[PDB]
Design a protein around this motif. Structure first.
Motif, PDB file in Angstrom:
ATOM      1  N   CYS B 121      63.934 -60.401 -12.069  1.00  0.00           N
ATOM      2  CA  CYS B 121      63.163 -59.629 -11.115  1.00  0.00           C
ATOM      3  C   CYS B 121      63.324 -60.352  -9.797  1.00  0.00           C
ATOM      4  O   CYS B 121      63.372 -61.767  -9.814  1.00  0.00           O
ATOM      5  CB  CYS B 121      61.571 -59.695 -11.693  1.00  0.00           C
ATOM      6  N   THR B 125      59.269 -58.307  -6.287  1.00  0.00           N
ATOM      7  CA  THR B 125      59.067 -57.855  -7.531  1.00  0.00           C
ATOM      8  C   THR B 125      58.891 -58.497  -8.711  1.00  0.00           C
ATOM      9  O   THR B 125      58.920 -59.827  -8.903  1.00  0.00           O
ATOM     10  CB  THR B 125      60.363 -56.898  -7.893  1.00  0.00           C
ATOM     11  N   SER B 127      58.275 -58.000 -13.328  1.00  0.00           N
ATOM     12  CA  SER B 127      57.974 -57.123 -14.583  1.00  0.00           C
ATOM     13  C   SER B 127      56.942 -58.012 -15.672  1.00  0.00           C
ATOM     14  O   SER B 127      57.570 -58.834 -16.367  1.00  0.00           O
ATOM     15  CB  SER B 127      59.266 -56.787 -15.153  1.00  0.00           C
ATOM     16  N   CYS B 136      61.861 -53.465 -12.305  1.00  0.00           N
ATOM     17  CA  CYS B 136      61.025 -54.615 -11.787  1.00  0.00           C
ATOM     18  C   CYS B 136      60.015 -53.696 -10.655  1.00  0.00           C
ATOM     19  O   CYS B 136      60.603 -52.626  -9.880  1.00  0.00           O
ATOM     20  CB  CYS B 136      61.722 -55.641 -10.982  1.00  0.00           C
ATOM     21  N   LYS B 155      57.743 -63.732 -11.038  1.00  0.00           N
ATOM     22  CA  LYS B 155      58.679 -62.692 -11.692  1.00  0.00           C
ATOM     23  C   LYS B 155      57.984 -61.955 -12.682  1.00  0.00           C
ATOM     24  O   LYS B 155      58.190 -60.673 -13.103  1.00  0.00           O
ATOM     25  CB  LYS B 155      60.061 -63.207 -12.053  1.00  0.00           C
TER      26      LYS B 155
END
Lengths: 164, 164
Positions: B121, B125, B127, B136, B155
């Motif tokens: 990511c 962003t 995830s 992401c 991240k």
């Protein structure tokens, strides 16, 4: 191949499925984890195009005699009826083509929808047989035969060729 | 619709018949006094095009599991096999897509023929879930929230929003 939107019953998600090719319909729509499934139209039904429909269209009533099929009821097509050959459609049903009498010939060939159209044999041509199909035939060329005309022709007969 | 030449058995005349539409074949050729007749390909066979052939083509062997049909054996089509969704073909058969670990996301969506392609990511962003599908996600915008960042994100996690 094209695609269509479908609303998934369990989730109310709007999916994008692949269409089914002509002659098939969609026997189970796609979901979030499997592809859509196509089945062939059962006997008696058809689809003309790539579609996303759930039942195939129904084939029209059989052709009323004397009429016959020029296309059959098949997966990709509805049956299509026509007057058999040597006949043509007028009003209700089918009538046989005009038969051009001796001394006439076909100007316009007959179709499944128009009758035949006759014209008197023009000079130099003739026709010796009733026929709803044959054109007036040119006389035999007596000149380019190394011969001469013993009897002239008529609209009904060739000229007759020879010498003396 | 197209046409084809046929040599009539009894007379040795070369006729011109109308072709049969896809998904059918010619069950009796035309003659001097009747039209050709089309029949639908029996289950197990197909024709891709308008043709003049006397037997439909044979459908390929069934799809080897884990593979599944993306087109069926139908009048107009040969069956066509694919890896089911969430899998992709490599060599022999099918393998499941890469699952992007927390902190990565999908850059290139996976296909029936290519695996998924992951990237860490990028900053801003994150995830938070293993997934062979998700991209992401941008952090929540604390500014345009009338709030501020209490904890920064990572991240793997969103930033957490509030005041004081």
């Amino acid at each position: 191949i094209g695609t269509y939107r479908h609303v998934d019953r369990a989730t109310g998600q709007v999916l994008t499925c692949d269409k089914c090719p002509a002659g098939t319909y969609v026997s189970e729509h796609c979901t979030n984890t499997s592809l859509r499934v196509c089945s062939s139209c059962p006997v008696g039904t058809f689809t003309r195009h790539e579609n996303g429909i759930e039942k195939c269209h129904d084939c029209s009533q059989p052709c009323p005699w004397p009429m016959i099929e020029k296309l059959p009821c098949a997966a990709l097509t509805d049956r299509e009826c026509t007057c058999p050959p040597g006949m043509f459609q007028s009003n209700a049903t089918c009538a046989p083509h005009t038969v051009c009498p001796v001394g006439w010939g076909v100007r316009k060939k007959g179709t499944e929808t128009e009758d035949v159209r006759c014209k008197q044999c023009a000079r130099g041509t003739f026709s010796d047989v009733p026929s709803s199909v044959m054109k007036c035939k040119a006389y035999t060329d007596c000149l380019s035969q190394n011969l001469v005309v013993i009897k002239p022709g008529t609209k009904e007969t060739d000229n007759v060729c020879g010498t003396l």
